[PDB]
């Protein structure tokens, strides 16, 4: 979840899916 993203800010419009697509650690 972009809200709990481990790395810097993801997506350019709260696109969590775009984030989790590559963020899961």
Shortest distance, position 12 Cβ to Zn ion, whole Å: 12
23 touches Zn ion by CB under 5 A? yes
- Residue 18 makes contact with Zn ion by CB under 5 A: no
- Rg of the chain, C-alpha, whole Å: 7
Please state the closest distance from residue 22 (CB atom) to Zn ion, in A: 7
- Using CA atoms of 9, 7, 21, 16 in order, give the dihedral in degrees to the nearest 10: -40
The size of the interface with Zn ion (CB under 5 A), counted in residues, is 4
**Contacts of residue 5, Cβ cutoff 8 Å, sequence gap at least 6:** 19, 23
Q: Give the residues lining the site for Zn ion (CB under 5 A).
A: 5, 10, 19, 23
């Amino acid at each position: 979840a972009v809200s709990a993203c481990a790395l810097s800010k993801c997506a350019a419009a709260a696109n969590v899916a775009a984030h989790m697509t590559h963020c899961a650690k």
